[PDB]
Design a protein around this ligand. Sequence first.
Ligand SMILES: Nc1nc2c(ncn2[C@@H]2O[C@H](COP(=O)(O)OP(=O)(O)OP(=O)(O)O)[C@@H](O)[C@H]2O)c(=O)[nH]1
Ligand SMILES: Nc1nc2c(ncn2[C@@H]2O[C@H](COP(=O)(O)OP(=O)(O)OP(=O)(O)O)[C@@H](O)[C@H]2O)c(=O)[nH]1
Ligand SMILES: Nc1nc2c(ncn2[C@@H]2O[C@H](COP(=O)(O)OP(=O)(O)O)[C@@H](O)[C@H]2O)c(=O)[nH]1
Ligand SMILES: Nc1nc2c(ncn2[C@@H]2O[C@H](COP(=O)(O)OP(=O)(O)O)[C@@H](O)[C@H]2O)c(=O)[nH]1
Ligand SMILES: [Mg+2]
Ligand SMILES: [Mg+2]
Lengths: 440, 440, 430, 428
Amino acid sequence: MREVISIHVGQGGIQVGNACWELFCLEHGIQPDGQMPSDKTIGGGDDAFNTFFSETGAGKHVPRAVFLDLEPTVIDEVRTGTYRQLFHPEQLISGKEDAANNFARGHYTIGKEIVDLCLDRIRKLADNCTGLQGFLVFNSVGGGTGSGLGSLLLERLSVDYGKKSKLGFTIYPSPQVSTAVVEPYNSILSTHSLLEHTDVAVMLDNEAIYDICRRNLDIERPTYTNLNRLIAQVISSLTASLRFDGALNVDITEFQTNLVPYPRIHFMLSSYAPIISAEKAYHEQLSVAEITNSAFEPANMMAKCDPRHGKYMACSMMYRGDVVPKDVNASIATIKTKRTIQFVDWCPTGFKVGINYQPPTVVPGGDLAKVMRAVCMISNSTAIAEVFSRLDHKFDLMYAKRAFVHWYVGEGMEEGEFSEAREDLAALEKDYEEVGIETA
Amino acid sequence: MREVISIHVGQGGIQVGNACWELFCLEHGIQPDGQMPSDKTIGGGDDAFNTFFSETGAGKHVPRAVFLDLEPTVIDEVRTGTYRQLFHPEQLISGKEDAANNFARGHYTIGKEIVDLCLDRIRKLADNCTGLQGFLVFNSVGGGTGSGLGSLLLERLSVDYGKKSKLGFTIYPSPQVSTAVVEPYNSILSTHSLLEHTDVAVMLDNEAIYDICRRNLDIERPTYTNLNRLIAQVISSLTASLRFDGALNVDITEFQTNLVPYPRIHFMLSSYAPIISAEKAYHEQLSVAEITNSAFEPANMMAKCDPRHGKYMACSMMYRGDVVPKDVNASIATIKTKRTIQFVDWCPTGFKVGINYQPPTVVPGGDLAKVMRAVCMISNSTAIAEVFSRLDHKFDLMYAKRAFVHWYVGEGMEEGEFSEAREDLAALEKDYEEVGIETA
Amino acid sequence: MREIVHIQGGQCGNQIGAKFWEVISDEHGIDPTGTYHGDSDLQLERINVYYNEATGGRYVPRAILMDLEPGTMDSVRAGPFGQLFRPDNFVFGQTGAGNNWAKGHYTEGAELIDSVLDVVRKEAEGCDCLQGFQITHSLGGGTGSGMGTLLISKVREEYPDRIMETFSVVPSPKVSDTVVEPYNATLSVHQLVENADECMVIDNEALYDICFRTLKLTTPTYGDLNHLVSAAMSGVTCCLRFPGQLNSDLRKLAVNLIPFPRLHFFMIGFAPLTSRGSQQYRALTVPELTQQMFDAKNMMCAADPRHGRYLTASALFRGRMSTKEVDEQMLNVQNKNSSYFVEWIPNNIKSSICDIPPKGLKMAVTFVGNSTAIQEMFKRVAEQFTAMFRRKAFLHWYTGEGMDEMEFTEAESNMNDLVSEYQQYQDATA
Amino acid sequence: MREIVHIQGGQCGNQIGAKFWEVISDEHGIDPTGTYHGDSDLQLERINVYYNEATGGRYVPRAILMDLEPGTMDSVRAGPFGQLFRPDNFVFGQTGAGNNWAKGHYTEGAELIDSVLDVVRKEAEGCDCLQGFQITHSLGGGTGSGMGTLLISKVREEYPDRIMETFSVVPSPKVSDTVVEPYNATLSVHQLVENADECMVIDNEALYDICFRTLKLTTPTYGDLNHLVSAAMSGVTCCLRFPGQLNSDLRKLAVNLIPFPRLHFFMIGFAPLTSRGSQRALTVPELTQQMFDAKNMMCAADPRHGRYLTASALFRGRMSTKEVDEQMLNVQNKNSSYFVEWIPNNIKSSICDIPPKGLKMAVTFVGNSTAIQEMFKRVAEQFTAMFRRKAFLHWYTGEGMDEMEFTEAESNMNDLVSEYQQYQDATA
Ligand SMILES: Nc1nc2c(ncn2[C@@H]2O[C@H](COP(=O)(O)OP(=O)(O)OP(=O)(O)O)[C@@H](O)[C@H]2O)c(=O)[nH]1
Ligand SMILES: Nc1nc2c(ncn2[C@@H]2O[C@H](COP(=O)(O)OP(=O)(O)OP(=O)(O)O)[C@@H](O)[C@H]2O)c(=O)[nH]1
Ligand SMILES: Nc1nc2c(ncn2[C@@H]2O[C@H](COP(=O)(O)OP(=O)(O)O)[C@@H](O)[C@H]2O)c(=O)[nH]1
Ligand SMILES: Nc1nc2c(ncn2[C@@H]2O[C@H](COP(=O)(O)OP(=O)(O)O)[C@@H](O)[C@H]2O)c(=O)[nH]1
Ligand SMILES: [Mg+2]
Ligand SMILES: [Mg+2]
């Protein structure tokens, strides 16, 4: 019944996770103990949660989510947190020693020990689930655990579970702002694995979302926790159709069909539009036609690819709140007419729309305004190629010198695996132009 | 629905703006919060405001106005003011460093950074607008920002929005009283850009309006704030026909058709007639036929051009209050009979008229009497040439010495651009005599 | 039957229509909510002429209120009897003509007319027998002149046989309440003379004169000017709506008023109008009303008939008057005005009698006069237009919309041909 | 008798049906709990046409609510008159088609239909004499299109003689609320043209246009667009349910609307619909004008571009049959261009003494025209641009469909567009 297993791998994954499960808990009205207060004298929000939480039968709801890290610190913060009594102890899997920003540790040395225990936990969660929709996965491709073990998981999940959709929300390293020096190496080795085993991969670059906070929320000094809250609102809006009733319902299995036109092209962008500080919310109309235009703004994209370079191959507009399908109609129609927004020839109709009545929740202490309308647009653009070319350029500077390879080779990754990966990503950015080329 | 975007560029532009929006807020009954109090148990002044204010849908009305300055001080005074909660934070655009009375800074160096953000704000406002009537623009051609960026805006608006009328209320420096030494240089470089990109330019010289305050309001010591209030009353009277019901209705698109006889002759004067101190409002009759004769007084002209030298090419009388079209009839007819008022042979049917039933609003703390009649005459006169000839003379003294050019050239204005500008204004004052010449 | 479809085009047109449909509602006893509350059954016998009977015994005017300005709807709704008009019939643009014939004819108005024609066709087909149309528009403005003339061209191509009557406010040089009036009005008459069967030229100058002299109003408003136009408008088409000792109709007037096709400009004028403090002294008799209807003062056109010579005239007397006494007066006038009546075509004046008077009056008259004086009002527009066109002033607006200088020259030529032809039939002796 | 089995297939169909079974219930006086609370005995004389009388004197829609998504059950239950439908007739999968025609026809759909057919067989046999079915399904999605066409194919092989009616929502290029709409619709019409008797094409584009122009709605939702489709769906099959001065039925319409077997796509249009403010004299000529207005047709294609091969009006209420006929004649003399030269007296007429609730007179129009081309060319042009590059094709290929199907679907659809165009230009 619309069940979604959430796999949070690595620090970025878990910490994004924490923010997601705050939002979900508030949305379904689950308290930190994991007991919803039985109010309105009717089960009015009954079965809404069954997407993300599993009723224990004793009145305790448990998140359908595996938090996985090779490092104990991040998962320990969850265990010594407000939601300590929410998450099932076995689901919160820990490692003793971190991958230390090395794909190889995460893919071979350390990962192979922990993946065995994780899959067992996923099988136990998949047994409880009746008509599972898909696997949402959260991994940082800059970091070791998220790259290495997070890739190894997806490979193993693809054989075991087969059809069940794997939607991967990935935190690709922004080119200007990088947290670690060895990120390019990790990213590329991760992407080659991810290129085969994921169905749809939603790309998010921290720097891009950092710029959105400074521009829309008007915070001079954004944190990761402020960032993770915007990521959560996107995920909420995407799965929303399942949890809450809507006019034009979507599903995680639908995006798959409507967004990836060729198997390898499964990389996407995202843009939740009504990101507004309650300061400037006073003075904004916030009509549907504005929210749509605000979604297709080059700046409001949460990955830092400027889609004006590319051509939109498919768009998946996901509206929430006081949204009329007539009003959505004109808004798309005006976007189809605009020059700045350009569509591939071979996609003559390139809009999947989804309209939920449920408006988005305002998280307390949360940098957002309570707004009566919204939209999360996941877009397949030819512009994505630009991010991959920069990560290829930034990598090709390395592996000319063999710049950090001794680490990766020492931990079980043959040197030819780097050359393989770069060759396959070079084959991707060949494909992305080829589809971009007008029909012959 | 009769929407008018108001672009306030430069100190003079913003400070004039403030005074305009005090008046507009009082006229439509909008309070400083932005919420009209719902009184008379009917929406009686409902849709009146839609000209100037956009309903947000929550009972807050936002001004359709972008306040632009390269300097943060003037826009900061609006943000720390009574109308702080009226104006959209984004609409109030700021710069870090001022153009410093240098067109070149405003046109190239600084202006090119900010204009990008302004146009986005104009597009968002233009999207909300359904059947926009035109762009009212308020700049000071003596100053840097208003000359430089204000010109750059109009160029960029002309390509983007095309047909939509651009009525420019400009504060041309009075010859006797000048605030800055480098004014002539700015003015001429601004006028060449303004000569092409504006549809109708209404000229207002501060000294002229200062004299009107000393003569009509009987204030020994007028300020800018007293001046700005008289400017607001004119703008109110011009856009009145849209906002309030009238017998003979005009529109911003009409004046265009009924004032500029040739594309380059779009410069105009203006004269609001019943400017009366409540002190002498006792002794006066204030009939329509006196108000009209008080509009064609050479002194009451708000730009300091004496129209007795020139010939009236067109005239647009805009009455307000207890005005009968039979009474207006005899008033124009007597003016057409007068000798002092002279008309070009090629416009024998002078005087467009517009009659609104709404009388003008008496602003509290405002140097004016509550009067049951009014008129704002915008006039195309061959006398305008005189102002341009003085600004050309005052400029020709400069650029004989290359007097201040080093500043403008240092900030990316090629020296030949000055010579270009002077040649084009010399070509204007040729045209103004040519039309003034009687038919062959 | 003999139904009449009204088109009130342009601000001036709508405001005339508003007052007109108030005036006709009083005579037919229709209340502002569309219910009949009249006392006499004569008030509903021929109501179908102007009103189409809606469901629930509501009466809806057969009016097509067209403009390019949306603000004009609010004004005709605001007016008393504003609810009468059916909401579908209201067809309004957004931008407005901008006192520009071109914008209202070639561009903005060229887009709207296709929507109006669909309403015109709809109301025209509903009639079993269409008498024709009464278009009320101003030649001076952009909308009324532009769309008015473009609609008039369109309706005539579809319905050639059906009468096309036009009550048009011509711009007067005294008022000159717009600068570009001469251009609008010159381009208008060119279209009107080819496509209008009978044009009744109205002027604000004359209407004000009737308000400052014939009536004694301290404050004559556009309300009162419209009231006079309306009063006449009823008169022109009464013998349709009511019985008569001698019956007439629009085609009958046209047949006797228009000697040659191009001379269909007439001067309307209402006779029983009196100052409220000059009503005791005045006696209400056929001779007294005949004196006022032939007084050059009474005419709602600037040009005095004294300068011209009546090619013909038509009186539509109201109430219970002896037809002999009427006929005696019409004869008497013609013997008096030897010079002012054309030598050829004797017995120049036509007379129609309608039994039913206007409300609160015992007798009344409406006058329609084809004279060579009307020329003189068109010369004013020509003299004023030429002066502007000598130099190509305000032309770039009209040229901007995509009208060519060739159109302005052909408009002046065609109006100069009208002026020559009236001067021919004035000077002509036979 | 002359009973009709309704199959509301896909999220679109289940919503159209939900509103239809509200509308039809009001006409027959049936309350949301199934009990009869009507004031006229005429409301129950021909109820058995659509309902199966249950024990305790309850009335049940002959409605088989099929889908591949179990969330659409919670929609039609939530709705008022949701308790009318038989829970055994509800047939719902788990996964969902995923706007994929291949999934809803060849795999996921091919495993449910065997359960649906058993229910169709059950409700079809219970009728003494079956007039036909009235499937309602979008050609835009995967469930409505896939299962819809597969069911339609199955029920035709079993019941060849019975009338297969199909009120189908075609994807409009203006709306375009799904990306792979063209692929679904193109594969859909290939099956429909073979295995449907009459297919009343509907468009959301035309239904929005009626709500913004003909009616003046400030916020037209999918409930209001449904409320129009239902009014028409009532009007097509009325003379079955009520007496007539001149009666009709589905077969009678089909025999007079389908000149040749492959030309059975029609434009439906309900006449007396008016803006609430603009409430017009209600006479047969005033209604005849609006049903023939190219604004009123619930199909993006304006008849004016095409020519009516034939028409059919199903007038409602107490009207003079002479006055109706006069108006039908009059229309054909005006629109000499918009009525095929051969086959004279193109327009059929039908009268039904009983009007719809809260109206004195009404109409329901049905027009087989060569304009209907101009809505299948849009789907063709779009579909072609996609299939040149084999875009989004690995989905449909992956569910065991071949590239041979997609080509014959374009072939068979281009043959239809060829066939109408022939009869437009044809002069006899
Ligand atoms: N949005 C967000 N991204 C984060 C956060 N923490 C880390 N990241 C991203 O992850 C990258 C660093 O990788 P980590 O997630 O720390 O590494 P890991 O996958 O846990 O594996 P190890 O390197 O072995 O610890 C950064 O470049 C960020 O892009 C966080 O709190 N929020
Ligand atoms: N009426 C009026 N005119 C003003 C006012 N302030 C400045 N001006 C006019 O503007 C000229 C000076 O230009 P500013 O407005 O200071 O310059 P700016 O366009 O803001 O550009 P910056 O120099 O970059 O600040 C004076 O000569 C006046 O003509 C004011 O408060 N009222
Ligand atoms: N008699 C009369 N004339 C009017 C009225 N309103 C406007 N006019 C005249 O119409 C002319 C302009 O035409 P108008 O119809 O207002 O402009 P349009 O709507 O753009 O065609 C002016 O010169 C006025 O003298 C009115 O109520 N009565
Ligand atoms: N009239 C109407 N059309 C709808 C509705 N919902 C969806 N549609 C249309 O049907 C198409 C999607 O079909 P849907 O039934 O949701 O997908 P399916 O379940 O895979 O067939 C879109 O092109 C929509 O325009 C509705 O409630 N009413
Ligand atoms: Mg870590
Ligand atoms: Mg300044």
